[PDB]
Amino acid sequence: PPGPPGPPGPPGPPGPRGPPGXGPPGPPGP
Amino acid sequence: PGPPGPPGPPGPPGPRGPPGXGPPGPPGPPG
Amino acid sequence: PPGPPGPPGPPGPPGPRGPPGXGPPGPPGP
């Protein structure tokens, strides 16, 4: 018969970079 | 004597991607 | 007798997309 199965493969590659983040209004003028 | 066994199963997913790179807010109100 | 243990499995899929990034305050008002 065939031999036993081989080993699991390696982890896949990293996922893509996330989306850009979301700043507040600037300071008031004096 | 028999032939090679089947390939192994797929690996797990890769790691989550890195965090993204936000824009400035609007100008402040007038004084 | 059985054959040899089999070849390596394939890589997993890509990981999930990253989270959103972290912006600055806007410019001061006039």
Author numbering:
A (entry chain C), C (entry chain B): 1 to 30
B (entry chain A): 2 to 32
Provide the authors' original text about this structure.
At the molecular level, collagen forms a right‐handed triple helix consisting of three peptide strands, which adopt a left‐handed polyproline II (PPII) type helix conformation and are held together by interstrand hydrogen bonds.
Using common SPPS protocols, the Fmoc‐protected ProM1 and ProM2 derivatives were successfully incorporated into the [XY] position of the CMP sequence Ac‐(PPG)5‐PRG‐PPG‐[XY]G‐(PPG)3‐NH2. [a] Peptide sequence: Ac‐(PPG)5‐PRG‐PPG‐[ProM2]G‐(PPG)3‐NH2; torsion angles were averaged for the central nine amino acid triplets. KGaARegarding the overall structure, the three peptide strands adopted the typical triple‐helical conformation, and no distortion could be detected, which was underlined by comparison of key parameters and alignment with (PPG)10.21 Considering the modified positions, ProM2 units were assembled in a PPII‐type helical shape (like all the other Pro rings) and were well‐embedded into the overall structure. In combination with the fact that all ProM2 units adopted an endo,exo ring puckering (as predicted by DFT calculations), a close packing of Pro rings within the triple helix was observed. Because of their desired endo/exo flip the proline rings of Ac‐ProM2‐OMe were positioned in space that is also occupied by proline rings in a collagen environment. In fact, this endo/exo flip could be found in a crystal structure of the ProM2‐CMP facilitating a close packing of proline residues (see below). A pseudo‐equatorial orientation of the rigid ethylene linker relative to the Yyy ring is sterically favored and thus controls the Cγ ring flip depending on the configuration at Cδ (endo for Ac‐ProM1‐OMe, exo for Ac‐ProM2‐OMe). Regarding the reference peptide, the stability was slightly decreased for the ProM2‐CMP or maintained in the case of the H2‐ProM2‐CMP.
